[PDB]
Amino acid sequence: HHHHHHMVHITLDRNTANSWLIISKDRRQVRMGDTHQNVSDNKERFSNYPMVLGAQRFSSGKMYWEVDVTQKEAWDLGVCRDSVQRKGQFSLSPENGFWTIWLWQDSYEAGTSPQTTLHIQVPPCQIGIFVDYEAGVVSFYNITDHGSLIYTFSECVFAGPLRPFFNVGFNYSGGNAAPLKLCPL
Numbered sequence: 001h002h003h004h005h006h007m008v009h010i011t012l013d014r015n016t017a018n019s020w021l022i023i024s025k026d027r028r029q030v031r032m033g034d035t036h037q038n039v040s041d042n043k044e045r046f047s048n049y050p051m052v053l054g055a056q057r058f059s060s061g062k063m064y065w066e067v068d069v070t071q072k073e074a075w076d077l078g079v080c081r082d083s084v085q086r087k088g089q090f091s092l093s094p095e096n097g098f099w100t101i102w103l104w105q106d107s108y109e110a111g112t113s114p115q116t117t118l119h120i121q122v123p124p125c126q127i128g129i130f131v132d133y134e135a136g137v138v139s140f141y142n143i144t145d146h147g148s149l150i151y152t153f154s155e156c157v158f159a160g161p162l163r164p165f166f167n168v169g170f171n172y173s174g175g176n177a178a179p180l181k182l183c184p185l
């Protein structure tokens with residue numbers, strides 16, 4: 001792909017984070033802690049899952065960023081509406097305001113409803129995410145495999161400002177402690 005020149009500097013919004021997450025000083029890395037991280041509750045925090053939003057809001061234009069997923073067993077990545085539900089249980093779907101892919105149990109899937117199987121020959125260590133607001137497109141790229149396409153959501157109905165979306169996943173297995181990292185431009 002040739003989307004790299006739309007690169008944006010994403011930072012994580014502490015206020016939106018699940019209370020077990022640990023975000024680095026530079027706001028560029030996040031991991032699952034082994035306990036509550038001693039923050040007050042607020043209506044922005046994702047309560048049920050290890051999720052956090054980027055601080056940046058997008059309502060026009062083309063945007064690109066990259067995320068490092070090295071040695072993780074589970075994660076979700078993409079974008080979402082600023083007004084997605086924070087509390088309780090929900091599915092990641094465009095109907096609920098999410099445009100995402102994930103790794104789960106050794107398979108990759110796109111967060112359609114129902115979910116869609118992805119075909120990845122080279123397990124990615126870094127994921128590229130491209131948003132074209134005007135066109136209604138969200139695309140995912142395999143940076144480890146020379147930028148090959150993973151998935152395109154088209155005919156997107158964003159219906160609001162968009163925020164970068166992250167889920168570090170649970171660590172029930174003891175094999176999923178590694179962070180998500182926003183990669184330098």
Ligand SMILES: CN(C)c1ccncc1
Pocket residue numbers: 075076092102103104115
């Ligand atoms: C429904 N399902 C298998 C998942 C959804 C989101 N992230 C991971 C898995």
